[model samples]
Target chain A: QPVLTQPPSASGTPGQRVSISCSGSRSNLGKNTVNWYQQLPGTAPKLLIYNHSRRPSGVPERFSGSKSGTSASLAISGLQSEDEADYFCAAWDDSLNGLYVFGTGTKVTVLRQPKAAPSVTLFPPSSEELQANKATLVCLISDFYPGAVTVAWKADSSPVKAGVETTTPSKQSNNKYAASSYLSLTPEQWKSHRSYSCQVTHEGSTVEKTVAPT
Target chain B: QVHLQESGPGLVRPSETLSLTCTVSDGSISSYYWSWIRQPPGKGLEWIGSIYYTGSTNYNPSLKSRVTMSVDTSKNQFSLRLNSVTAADTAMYYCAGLDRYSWNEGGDHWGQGILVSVSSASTKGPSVFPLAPSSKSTTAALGCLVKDYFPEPVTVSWNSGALTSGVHTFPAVLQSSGLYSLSSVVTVPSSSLGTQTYICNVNHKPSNTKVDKKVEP
Candidate 1:
């Protein structure tokens, strides 16, 4: 797991488009291409593009990305009403055996939209390794603008098991959260764990943790 | 205001022909080079190469042998072909304006990305084919393939930068369909390949954004 880096939010007048940028450490951004995502309030994130300049399906003509050295950027133009949302940049980590990672992420708030909130997160409960058949899904959401929100897991991507886990405020950062949702899918092997994700949600917006094996 | 879109079967099975197309819009297919590039979920961007409107083409040296980039200016699109491609060749494929200076990092202005997943056995195209983890040889092979595509007659002085093996460059060519494709192989000795960067650059360029690959440890 690499530390994700991003700016809080970018602002511009109506019809006056803006851009949000993201940077990451040697693992992801330094070795590979950066991917951008758009998050609308209470909705799933949409894939914008990868490797700077490439756009996924249905991505408006506005969003674009560019890179130089260790830094990468995402820019948007011809602003539209539906464009007010949070943006994130992600990269494939070359440092951690291809563990997929994301930047802290940037936000684009259209003037008329509601002020987006902030959140907090806590890493591996102990930074200590876990064995196979064992998993850590702390599902922390931190560094958000306005913290103090409910956190839980939905059994099937639906809010079936609400708050089955407990969360604490001020657990790690100012106005942030700390919590865990263990995935008993399989035990750790002390080695050979291919993939597992830890998810975080705030103000109906969510992010996740992805790890890859060597 | 030119825009581009990549369309192809999303799914491909092992040893299958991974075919894809890039459709350009709001602009003419002429006056520019159409190109292809790909990247894994969390890997460095691979330079796949480009096809010039003048009918000249340059490819990622690694894929040059198996890969072919062609244009259908009449259809306002360009295509990439990598024959007998396995999962190792699978990644998100992108199309963009190959710019006048094809090797210039500033060459990219507009692009559209399309994903192709290769599986073991299936209907092919548009399906996610999880990679089975490849050997490092694949990367080296592909790296050499990419060099084959950027074929402009140029000189190289592989010192301590990227030519990893005390820098030895050799020019090679193979006759295909009665025509010869040019290639240069610069082996950077793993030990002396210091600083992770080797320059295979253009003759007169202000910013050396051309022919440089940043190596990762």
Candidate 2:
């Protein structure tokens, strides 16, 4: 791994500005651009800054990056509570043929807020969207704090593992997080009234909601 | 809008080479950088290497002597070859596309990872923590030390109802035997002492394991 350094922790109150630094050397940062990754709790790291200073199309402008001589930094202005997550820096190294190096991640915190659990809702497919033999069930989680949350599903209390899609937790304008998980089911299974439930866990508290075609 | 898929041998011998390839679809292999990243069971993500469309490459220094990354323009594919492999080399390897900008690496698209096993490489650690000192005052100095672990990318955090100040986590360092060790220290403020319990949470993501040790005061 390339020798890159980053602070272990950083914090700021909501609406305040926060900055994290990634330090590297001649073989890596001096010769290349740096990219940053934002990792919400329980989710894979998402690209925040690619090509050193450019934001991905859908990312907010509040997040900015710059590079100076082998050093790079990420700044999150107008920081939101949902911005509380871990950040990592990466680049290509010219050392030893070639290699990619990642800095140790820094955890960003939104100061001093009471834990906020998400509101969970189960949304079944609409009549028009439902097919004769198939349908979709959605577990929507909204208004949660601290970003990291897990969603689980059960068909009659047994875990439902197949044909499920859970999205990355995304920050809303209000600084809380929202995410959705979709489960596809057959019409026959939906009509069986087997009661599909969506369970959400934030920190220590968990909420589960059940739904079936009425 | 590019897609990537990784395929390789399911198993390899301890002293033999480990090879894997990535196939790119819905996107051109040109103008993009391809990368290989891996996570051992219960461990964290590690950047293995990167290959440009023209075949230039770079690899993690720790694994440099044993790694070679190459790309094939005609096939729109890239491959990783790791030599003299051992159990510590076993991991869930993923292939991804790195956006191009001065080789500024960012993996935007990922493949469904494949697990590569080195028969004797199931290095397991009991990652032990020793008894810590008692705190007489509210400003307590606490430490969490983890040792003798294989693989890269372990996570260590301090939990005391909130992310507090004066907390420091050290990066995992490779030891001579190929295992890793690291530690973290946090000083609890006087105001929040006794009213809350503090824990040092160590997560090994690949094996899906966690070690929560109470920060004694």
Candidate 3:
């Protein structure tokens, strides 16, 4: 068998948290490292662990990951109306070809998903989809979330100008919202094919959108 | 404040090796010592030890007998183990670490705690993947087959419009196959996806090479 398995049952009330654990093997748990994942009902398990404690790009600090021997776990606290969802754990196994493994998921029962965490979409209005030379790009952000978020085109480390438009229409879900930003910049920005990046933040967790326009 | 929590299974039979990792809810990875600590059933916390990250190792004198720990800087998390364990060895295990927030306030240790139980035989790889049919479905699962582990372990970093915060970057889970994944959740703005970019990065020691992936691409 592999290193990790999960709890068949987990429960939480609205505004309360529910945790899911991932079990690991002796080699994996005793020896290697393990990680965790989060799936919001429908979608791939998102990166919830980096080394052991580091969370990924846009994950909420409220949604945390951890590990011990033969196990990794994810905890959802301050359960929001949207906290109802499934989660998992991940790990690295040297015994098994260094393959990364994940635990099954646990779902928290929430009154409702306040907002379907927005999905990011990138587009090139012009013929050249990924033009490193162009500094400005058009962007559309779907799905609404809490907190103020902005968009900008990053030329390496510097922030370039962009025409930003924010829109909230009670779009799909009561908690759903959307916004758009136009990246503006200089020709010198053209070099790395996928060098630019976009980002948004809430509390401390930042939701960054990136892509390699190749 | 920095906090971490572990949730996992509790038992296994003989001849089976057990394992588990932790998820950090708040804190950065750049400056921290990721450690693994465990306890037996209805017992106190045992110091299984830590991995300073890439290429570094430290084990508990007691459990070191059968325990192991490795760091995946790329994934932003570290791991632990206690080999050939029997039911007597079973307990709530956890990955421990100290964060800037913790150290800054004259605190040398953790602000939150996590627990996970282990066993002998387990798939031990990315066995958890969700595949739900409908888009409206609120829950789904899916993980790829195991691919070769990255040659080296690295540090997890964040890249985008904002400077990479050590606290937010999580682990990059690259399954057995080429399918690479990260476990941290962040808030994104609409314009950023089409306009800017974001990357979760890791710095490894032995491998030296860094691993990073951008979403919204």
Candidate 4:
């Protein structure tokens, strides 16, 4: 369990108001100032509010914070689409020497946009040694929404457990997400297998890309 | 013996892509995963990406959006490209090969890293000082402190011969002003403390500066 607790998710439409709560103890929030941070995907956390309720320079007035006793809250009024990010509350603990404590984090979403599915593409091994020794296959997943995807590799319709590596989905410059997975095999295994496939499950839909030795 | 060497531009502008290539020598690149790892000036290592000889790739999620990797088995070379770089991207970039069947999956062969600066920045040499000695009946502990250094790579050595068994160095800690500080300690026998002086030599690489402080009992 986290020293500071927060809700897992929160949502609001444009111009709507939503607030997240962070609860802590006397050794932390009650004795020290509370601060809030906003973290965009794939970026470092930025301080939104410090000294319990003070906004740093350039942070919009729509984001506000407050502390009461051992609990704190961050409220977003007139929320915008760009406000979709993760929020965390932190405070300094005076017990057990001294340390910083942070909330479990709350993911805020703007409910005005539609979901996007990933485009899947599979590439066969690029090496000429595919006929002699070893090979690798790549599966590219791009332009995805929600940033959550499950990838599995199969050889000849059977699940492959070894020599597979999948990356976490990363947000692209266009606001969509991208990820990739790789599968490694020896020539004997590649020759014995009739087909290899990368199956990706995203947002209730499954996409499979298959490849075979030429 | 296998050797790896990295080649790339030494400077890149902010928001530009940084590209580097690693050439493998005296070894076949067919069986291993080539990896790109980097360390920001004075920081720990960060894995950028990895690529197999057959062109399969796995990128660090933190950098995957801006990172791309490629391999050319015929030339025994692999390359890395990182885009949208800023001052934070300035680092020493290294290429390495990971043993596919190793239990740890760590780098088995490495290259001499190339320093890539993202734009120009100021470098500060370190200030060295000797801390007060902590004495015991038979042995004494001497500390050398290195502080206020920018671009965090520094090496510390003691003048007290090659005996490293009693030497301890701490990891560099980043200070509030974007500089780094660290300390190293050497233990000496009390019989030699009054007769000999112990010196701590520090080498700060970015500024090509060297500073030494001595502790005399």
Supply candidate 4's per-residue lDDT for A170: 63
RMSD (CA, Å), candidate 2 to true, equals 20.8
lDDT of each: 0.49, 0.70, 0.46, 0.70
lDDT of candidate 4 over B1-217, digit per residue (tens): 6688899998987667899999999877875668887755433345576788776777665677889899877888898988777666777787877543332222255677778877636688886656445345576766666656777679888883454767756455444234566666666787877777788888888999988777664
lDDT of 2 at B135: 45
Could you estimate the TM-score for every candidate?
0.33, 0.49, 0.27, 0.30
Off by over 4 Å in 2: A40-44, A80-84, A96-98, A112-214, B7-19, B39-45, B52-57, B68-75, B81-92, B99-217
Docking level of model 1: incorrect
Please give the DockQ score of every candidate, comma-separated: 0.01, 0.09, 0.03, 0.01
The digit string of per-residue lDDT tens for model 3 on A36-108 reads 5444421223445656676545668887767776667777877776655445554444542233344433444
**Ranking of candidates on lDDT, top first:** 4, 2, 1, 3
Best by DockQ: 2
* A93-186 per-residue lDDT for model 4 (tens digits): 6654344456756767776456678887565653443643656565667777665566779998898867765545567666767766656678
Mind giving the per-residue lDDT tens digits that candidate 3 earns over B1-217? Answer: 5565553454555445666666665666656767654434322234466566556565544455677776666666565655665544555555556331323332223423333333333222221111111122332211111112333233454563354322222233322122223323344444444565555454444434445545433
Cα lDDT of candidate 3 equals: 0.46
Off by over 4 Å in 3: A1-3, A111-214, B1-217
Which prediction has more favorable lDDT, 1 or 3? 1
Count of backbone clashes, every candidate in sequence: 47, 14, 129, 1
Better of 1 and 4 by TM-score: 1
Q: Which ten residues in a row have the lowest lDDT in candidate 3 chain A?
A: A163-172
